[PDB]
């Protein structure tokens, strides 16, 4: 459905569903970040130790393990959101699985930028703030999991998107007909075409002075694919440089 | 100011880019497509024997056959860099950038542009070579021993999907300019002027596609998305170049012309 009212209705539906699925929105994160109960700041080992008390015995490994756990909850929220995208649950079930498998990390890093500024990232449901410099200080390769993600977040956040923009952007990401192993490509591309039309209209109305925002956002798609390629590389380094690390079933499947 | 003038300047920019592209790139997509229909006729290289006969037919100006094909490809890519460099100068704003950023944009843009434009010369079954005088089959390229056999295949896979967008030379002129003006290349000194120029090229491309391909819903978005997949082609290309560098050491001035 392609008329203006249809696209506006889709935009509103997705925002509604996004607020329903994701407890910590960009609105709530930015209110936390700007101070409007201040989050506990983790900037070094001593503050990490206190933070673990105030908010796997090795440090870089412990941080990564809490990251895994949070990515599991994020995968759960994103799946609930995907089911709300019109047409998604009507697709071939194996294609639903593939779209989530290949889409969740791109969405995780998009939404992680909502929680980040140049100095650090909100953690634990907004109760903590881990500094960029602390994460930079971590031993190879763990030190390397977060830094270009901060590079990405700063430029992404300069686009000034709000939650209502992000709701549709994330849907566009999920409905990507180029995922490996998709059986029925066209039904997915049709849905994405309609989501793209809706995103275009949304940015034009919500950011009328932002020239080529639509194109600029689609370009971040590139940044996201690369980020996820880096993440997978870094998982492979971990396989080589660590001992037994338990992995959540969900993450095992997605990484396969 | 006056109504319609924004559209007019964006059309004038598109036209300027097209005429420049015509100047810089002798074998256009229109010309190559005509050749690919097969009615004059290019020499067809479909195996090792016809390759040997095609070196008699087409005199190439660049031993183990996979390595020879690879060397010819290096020669042709260097030629392509000079054509692209010349095209880049006619993109408004480009020559007024920091000289060092000009060099950076070109270093990190050319491969993306080479493989984009190579799709103009490709169908699902092979690729035009030597200024349209030869056609080498995808099957023959696929047959070359590892790692050479998989040099071209991902490029064919990309090209078939890219070609299904049915862009013409007027579209490609603007898309290539957008690629060159990428503000995210490593070591750029002044990002903002590059993005400002790319903004106006993106506006021109969007308008060009809306007018030239009205029945192609969201083609602008779909093209930007490909833009995304060229990057992967290139990264994997660069990965392969590193394999050859280290495992295919089998002279100095040559090495210097091809520093890459």
From Swiss-Prot, chain B:
<dbReference type="GO" id="GO:0042752">
    <property type="term" value="P:regulation of circadian rhythm"/>
</dbReference>
<dbReference type="GO" id="GO:0010628">
    <property type="term" value="P:positive regulation of gene expression"/>
</dbReference>
<comment type="function">
    <text>Nuclear receptor that binds peroxisome proliferators such as hypolipidemic drugs and fatty acids. Once activated by a ligand, the nuclear receptor binds to DNA specific PPAR response elements (PPRE) and modulates the transcription of its target genes, such as acyl-CoA oxidase. It therefore controls the peroxisomal beta-oxidation pathway of fatty acids. Key regulator of adipocyte differentiation and glucose homeostasis. ARF6 acts as a key regulator of the tissue-specific adipocyte P2 (aP2) enhancer.</text>
</comment>
<dbReference type="GO" id="GO:0010745">
    <property type="term" value="P:negative regulation of macrophage derived foam cell differentiation"/>
</dbReference>
<feature type="binding site">
    <location>
        <position position="237"/>
    </location>
    <ligand>
        <name>rosiglitazone</name>
    </ligand>
</feature>
<dbReference type="GO" id="GO:0009755">
    <property type="term" value="P:hormone-mediated signaling pathway"/>
</dbReference>
<dbReference type="GO" id="GO:0060336">
    <property type="term" value="P:negative regulation of type II interferon-mediated signaling pathway"/>
</dbReference>
<keyword id="KW-0550">Obesity</keyword>
<dbReference type="GO" id="GO:0032869">
    <property type="term" value="P:cellular response to insulin stimulus"/>
</dbReference>
<dbReference type="GO" id="GO:0048469">
    <property type="term" value="P:cell maturation"/>
</dbReference>
<dbReference type="GO" id="GO:1904706">
    <property type="term" value="P:negative regulation of vascular associated smooth muscle cell proliferation"/>
</dbReference>
<keyword id="KW-0219">Diabetes mellitus</keyword>
<dbReference type="GO" id="GO:0043409">
    <property type="term" value="P:negative regulation of MAPK cascade"/>
</dbReference>
<dbReference type="GO" id="GO:0060392">
    <property type="term" value="P:negative regulation of SMAD protein signal transduction"/>
</dbReference>
<dbReference type="GO" id="GO:0015909">
    <property type="term" value="P:long-chain fatty acid transport"/>
</dbReference>
<dbReference type="GO" id="GO:0030509">
    <property type="term" value="P:BMP signaling pathway"/>
</dbReference>
<dbReference type="GO" id="GO:0050872">
    <property type="term" value="P:white fat cell differentiation"/>
</dbReference>
<dbReference type="GO" id="GO:0003676">
    <property type="term" value="F:nucleic acid binding"/>
</dbReference>
<feature type="binding site">
    <location>
        <position position="258"/>
    </location>
    <ligand>
        <name>rosiglitazone</name>
    </ligand>
</feature>
<dbReference type="GO" id="GO:0070165">
    <property type="term" value="P:positive regulation of adiponectin secretion"/>
</dbReference>
<keyword id="KW-0539">Nucleus</keyword>
<dbReference type="GO" id="GO:0042789">
    <property type="term" value="P:mRNA transcription by RNA polymerase II"/>
</dbReference>
<dbReference type="GO" id="GO:1902895">
    <property type="term" value="P:positive regulation of miRNA transcription"/>
</dbReference>
<dbReference type="GO" id="GO:0008270">
    <property type="term" value="F:zinc ion binding"/>
</dbReference>
<dbReference type="GO" id="GO:0030855">
    <property type="term" value="P:epithelial cell differentiation"/>
</dbReference>
<dbReference type="GO" id="GO:0005829">
    <property type="term" value="C:cytosol"/>
</dbReference>
<dbReference type="GO" id="GO:0010888">
    <property type="term" value="P:negative regulation of lipid storage"/>
</dbReference>
<keyword id="KW-1017">Isopeptide bond</keyword>
<dbReference type="GO" id="GO:0019899">
    <property type="term" value="F:enzyme binding"/>
</dbReference>
<dbReference type="GO" id="GO:0033993">
    <property type="term" value="P:response to lipid"/>
</dbReference>
<keyword id="KW-0675">Receptor</keyword>
<dbReference type="GO" id="GO:1903243">
    <property type="term" value="P:negative regulation of cardiac muscle hypertrophy in response to stress"/>
</dbReference>
<feature type="domain" description="NR LBD">
    <location>
        <begin position="9"/>
        <end position="260"/>
    </location>
</feature>
<dbReference type="GO" id="GO:0035357">
    <property type="term" value="P:peroxisome proliferator activated receptor signaling pathway"/>
</dbReference>
<keyword id="KW-0090">Biological rhythms</keyword>
<dbReference type="GO" id="GO:1905599">
    <property type="term" value="P:positive regulation of low-density lipoprotein receptor activity"/>
</dbReference>
<dbReference type="GO" id="GO:0042593">
    <property type="term" value="P:glucose homeostasis"/>
</dbReference>
<dbReference type="GO" id="GO:0045600">
    <property type="term" value="P:positive regulation of fat cell differentiation"/>
</dbReference>
<dbReference type="GO" id="GO:0046965">
    <property type="term" value="F:nuclear retinoid X receptor binding"/>
</dbReference>
<dbReference type="GO" id="GO:1904179">
    <property type="term" value="P:positive regulation of adipose tissue development"/>
</dbReference>
<dbReference type="GO" id="GO:1900076">
    <property type="term" value="P:regulation of cellular response to insulin stimulus"/>
</dbReference>
<comment type="subunit">
    <text>Interacts with FOXO1 (acetylated form). Heterodimer with other nuclear receptors, such as RXRA. The heterodimer with the retinoic acid receptor RXRA is called adipocyte-specific transcription factor ARF6. Interacts with NCOA6 coactivator, leading to a strong increase in transcription of target genes. Interacts with coactivator PPARBP, leading to a mild increase in transcription of target genes. Interacts with NOCA7 in a ligand-inducible manner. Interacts with NCOA1 and NCOA2 LXXLL motifs. Interacts with ASXL1, ASXL2, DNTTIP2, FAM120B, MAP2K1/MEK1, NR0B2, PDPK1, PRDM16, PRMT2 and TGFB1I1.</text>
</comment>
